[PDB]
Design an enzyme around this catalytic site. Structure first.
Site, mmCIF file in Angstrom:
data_model
loop_
_atom_site.group_PDB
_atom_site.id
_atom_site.type_symbol
_atom_site.label_atom_id
_atom_site.label_comp_id
_atom_site.label_asym_id
_atom_site.label_seq_id
_atom_site.Cartn_x
_atom_site.Cartn_y
_atom_site.Cartn_z
ATOM 1 N N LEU B 52 -2.804 -6.488 24.457
ATOM 2 C CA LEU B 52 -4.944 -6.660 24.528
ATOM 3 C C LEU B 52 -5.677 -6.061 24.823
ATOM 4 O O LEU B 52 -6.997 -6.151 24.160
ATOM 5 C CB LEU B 52 -4.809 -7.539 24.537
ATOM 6 C CG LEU B 52 -3.971 -8.961 24.554
ATOM 7 C CD1 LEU B 52 -4.237 -10.570 25.576
ATOM 8 C CD2 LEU B 52 -4.358 -9.816 22.656
ATOM 9 N N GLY B 53 -5.459 -4.858 25.290
ATOM 10 C CA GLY B 53 -6.016 -3.899 25.956
ATOM 11 C C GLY B 53 -5.380 -2.672 27.222
ATOM 12 O O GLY B 53 -4.595 -3.273 27.962
ATOM 13 N N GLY B 55 -5.768 -0.183 29.963
ATOM 14 C CA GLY B 55 -6.436 1.118 31.610
ATOM 15 C C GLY B 55 -5.681 1.486 32.007
ATOM 16 O O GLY B 55 -4.420 1.739 31.880
ATOM 17 N N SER B 56 -5.872 2.357 33.574
ATOM 18 C CA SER B 56 -5.664 3.506 33.810
ATOM 19 C C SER B 56 -4.325 2.788 34.412
ATOM 20 O O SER B 56 -3.245 3.643 34.820
ATOM 21 C CB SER B 56 -6.480 4.453 34.234
ATOM 22 O OG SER B 56 -7.571 5.325 33.727
ATOM 23 N N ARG B 59 -2.085 -2.354 31.366
ATOM 24 C CA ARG B 59 -2.328 -2.758 30.296
ATOM 25 C C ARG B 59 -2.645 -4.516 30.557
ATOM 26 O O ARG B 59 -2.061 -4.950 31.314
ATOM 27 C CB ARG B 59 -1.814 -2.852 29.274
ATOM 28 C CG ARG B 59 -0.001 -3.159 28.810
ATOM 29 C CD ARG B 59 -0.078 -3.062 27.987
ATOM 30 N NE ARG B 59 1.178 -0.731 28.281
ATOM 31 C CZ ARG B 59 0.987 -0.747 26.424
ATOM 32 N NH1 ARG B 59 0.740 -1.059 25.475
ATOM 33 N NH2 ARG B 59 1.104 0.594 26.291
ATOM 34 N N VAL B 60 -3.025 -5.539 29.717
ATOM 35 C CA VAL B 60 -2.687 -6.712 29.424
ATOM 36 C C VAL B 60 -2.302 -6.952 28.051
ATOM 37 O O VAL B 60 -2.894 -6.269 26.924
ATOM 38 C CB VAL B 60 -3.588 -7.076 29.644
ATOM 39 C CG1 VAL B 60 -4.413 -8.782 29.404
ATOM 40 C CG2 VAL B 60 -4.909 -7.233 30.162
ATOM 41 N N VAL B 126 -7.635 -15.471 26.293
ATOM 42 C CA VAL B 126 -8.920 -15.765 25.800
ATOM 43 C C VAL B 126 -9.643 -15.173 24.400
ATOM 44 O O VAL B 126 -9.528 -13.931 24.075
ATOM 45 C CB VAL B 126 -10.261 -15.356 26.358
ATOM 46 C CG1 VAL B 126 -11.803 -15.568 26.161
ATOM 47 C CG2 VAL B 126 -9.953 -15.768 27.838
ATOM 48 N N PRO B 127 -9.286 -16.030 23.370
ATOM 49 C CA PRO B 127 -8.544 -15.573 21.668
ATOM 50 C C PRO B 127 -10.142 -14.851 21.108
ATOM 51 O O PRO B 127 -9.465 -14.049 20.083
ATOM 52 C CB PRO B 127 -8.835 -16.736 21.077
ATOM 53 C CG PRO B 127 -9.026 -17.812 21.270
ATOM 54 C CD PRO B 127 -9.060 -17.273 23.500
ATOM 55 N N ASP B 169 -19.771 -5.524 37.488
ATOM 56 C CA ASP B 169 -18.364 -4.890 36.733
ATOM 57 C C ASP B 169 -19.650 -5.460 35.175
ATOM 58 O O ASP B 169 -18.637 -5.588 34.533
ATOM 59 C CB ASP B 169 -17.985 -4.819 36.848
ATOM 60 C CG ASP B 169 -16.329 -3.930 36.672
ATOM 61 O OD1 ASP B 169 -15.174 -4.599 36.374
ATOM 62 O OD2 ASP B 169 -17.345 -3.256 35.731
ATOM 63 N N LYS B 171 -21.152 -6.119 31.562
ATOM 64 C CA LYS B 171 -21.590 -5.399 30.506
ATOM 65 C C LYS B 171 -21.058 -5.577 29.481
ATOM 66 O O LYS B 171 -19.943 -7.057 29.629
ATOM 67 C CB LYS B 171 -20.579 -3.330 30.550
ATOM 68 C CG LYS B 171 -19.148 -3.983 31.319
ATOM 69 C CD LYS B 171 -19.005 -2.165 31.097
ATOM 70 C CE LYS B 171 -17.736 -1.727 31.759
ATOM 71 N NZ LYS B 171 -16.991 -0.716 31.685
ATOM 72 N N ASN B 174 -17.189 -6.373 28.825
ATOM 73 C CA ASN B 174 -16.308 -6.660 30.580
ATOM 74 C C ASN B 174 -16.815 -8.748 29.913
ATOM 75 O O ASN B 174 -16.027 -9.036 30.726
ATOM 76 C CB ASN B 174 -16.471 -6.622 31.644
ATOM 77 C CG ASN B 174 -16.158 -5.326 31.649
ATOM 78 O OD1 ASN B 174 -15.284 -5.105 31.217
ATOM 79 N ND2 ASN B 174 -16.651 -4.888 32.777
ATOM 80 N N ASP B 187 -12.684 -9.657 35.415
ATOM 81 C CA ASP B 187 -12.468 -8.658 35.504
ATOM 82 C C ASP B 187 -13.157 -8.410 37.128
ATOM 83 O O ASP B 187 -14.585 -9.498 37.085
ATOM 84 C CB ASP B 187 -13.251 -6.922 35.062
ATOM 85 C CG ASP B 187 -12.468 -7.072 34.237
ATOM 86 O OD1 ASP B 187 -11.438 -7.609 33.456
ATOM 87 O OD2 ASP B 187 -12.179 -6.021 33.102
ATOM 88 N N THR B 204 -21.079 1.143 35.216
ATOM 89 C CA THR B 204 -20.853 1.198 33.968
ATOM 90 C C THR B 204 -22.648 2.341 34.760
ATOM 91 O O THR B 204 -23.099 1.812 34.913
ATOM 92 C CB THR B 204 -20.651 1.463 33.394
ATOM 93 O OG1 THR B 204 -19.279 0.226 33.239
ATOM 94 C CG2 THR B 204 -20.656 1.223 31.707
#
Ligand SMILES: CCCN(CC[NH3+])S(=O)(=O)c1cccc2cnccc12
Lengths: 19, 353
Positions: B52-53, B55-56, B59-60, B126-127, B169, B171, B174, B187, B204
């Protein structure tokens, strides 16, 4: 226009945190 | 005055009830904060479906619980990468916050566990995907639509701030949208418990409050600044401060100047001028009247705060949902298998996880 300026900024995609 | 007797008494009573709710919520949070849950599942309980996503850190993934058939979002963190990235404290903090909080717009941690290579946090799926996607697609949200989301953020920050949590965080990237069209906040790596000030440069660029940019000690008012940026972006389709490079963004943020689309209502501009207030002694959310300056603003006059909290308001937008496990509101990612090393990595660092 302001919208055009936004497109021009190159920051219309997902934005990274400072981290 | 602005309120007759009935309206003033109703508002006062409502504000007192908020105080009562928050005092109880703090009691409950502090109990769970002091005695966190751990090790409530394991990896072979789940089938991995799709990323689903990323990052460094890792992942998810969308996962399916084998016995219940329930779908979840599983955050996988590579311990060695977390250590290399200097994220040990943030990772432990995120999990500790998630297991301790309880609010209808904060994602629920359903399981957590770890193994030799990775950390795992299993959250509700969370779809509806990120608000960001819908905002860029639709262009901009109408003021009622933006307000429905904004009200949820106001209440969520009211809650978090009562727990002395600064969020930091915020934005559209997010904020997720759930099946009923309400917001989920997920997050918490940059969230921090602090009653007073803190100093870390984090966030950000577009969403940074001036006092962060200016390397000041700062407080929870940076979240109210960020709310201003979010409401502006939701309603305009672009944020109030942008430029080619972050340094130029920062110059605009600190300048005290903001410009508005002609289609913004006067009520909206007035709220945003008071949230996007460079002067901390004047910023809404930072004054003697606290969050009430925001909740009682004319732009929120039609908001039934309790009805928002109870999720009884009909959402302006319901994401497409073809059924459980539908991932169409998320991007496509390259699927990297996950390996557990034969050798436990980074054990001491993560004993609290
Ligand atoms: C590395 C990006 C991870 N994402 C967060 C984007 N700020 S995420 O994949 O959107 C996601 C995270 C946490 C819980 C979720 C629950 N349900 C769906 C997605 C979820």
């Amino acid at each position: 226009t302001t919208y055009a300026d936004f497109i021009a900024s190159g920051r219309t995609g997902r934005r990274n945190a400072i981290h | 005055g602005h309120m007759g007797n009935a309206a003033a008494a109703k508002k006062g009573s409502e504000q007192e009830s908020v105080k009562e709710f928050l005092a109880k919520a703090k009691e409950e949070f502090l109990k769970k904060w002091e005695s966190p849950s751990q090790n409530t599942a394991q990896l072979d309980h789940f089938d991995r479906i799709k990323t689903l996503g990323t990052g460094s850190f890792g992942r998810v993934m969308l996962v399916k619980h084998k016995e219940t058939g329930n779908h979840y979002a599983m955050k996988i963190l590579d311990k060695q990468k977390v250590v290399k990235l200097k994220q040990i404290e943030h990772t432990l903090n995120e999990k500790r916050i998630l297991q301790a909080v309880n609010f209808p717009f904060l994602v629920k941690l359903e399981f957590s566990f770890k193994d030799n290579s990775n950390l795992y946090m299993v959250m509700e799926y969370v779809p509806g995907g990120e608000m960001f996607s819908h905002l860029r697609r639709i262009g901009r949200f109408s003021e009622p639509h933006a307000r429905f989301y904004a009200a949820q953020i106001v209440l969520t920050f009211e809650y978090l701030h009562s727990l002395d949590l600064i969020y930091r965080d915020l934005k559209p990237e997010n904020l997720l949208i759930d099946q009923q069209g309400y917001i989920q906040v997920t997050d918490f790596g940059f969230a921090k418990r602090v009653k007073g000030r803190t100093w870390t440069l984090c966030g950000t660029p577009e969403y940074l409050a001036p006092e962060i940019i200016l390397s000041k000690g700062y407080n929870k008012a940076v979240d109210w600044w960020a709310l201003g940026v979010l409401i502006y972006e939701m309603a305009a389709g672009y944020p109030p401060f942008f430029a080619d490079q972050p340094i130029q963004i920062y110059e605009k943020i600190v300048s005290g100047k903001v410009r508005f689309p002609s289609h913004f209502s006067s009520d909206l501009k007035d709220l945003l001028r008071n949230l996007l207030q460079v002067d901390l002694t004047k910023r809404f959310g930072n004054l003697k009247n606290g969050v009430n300056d925001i909740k009682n603003h004319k732009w929120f006059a039609t908001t039934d705060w309790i009805a928002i909290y109870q999720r009884k308001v009909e959402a302006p937008f319901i994401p497409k949902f073809k059924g459980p496990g539908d991932t169409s509101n998320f991007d496509d990612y390259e699927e990297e298998e996950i390996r557990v090393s034969i050798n436990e990595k980074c054990g001491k660092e993560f004993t609290e996880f």
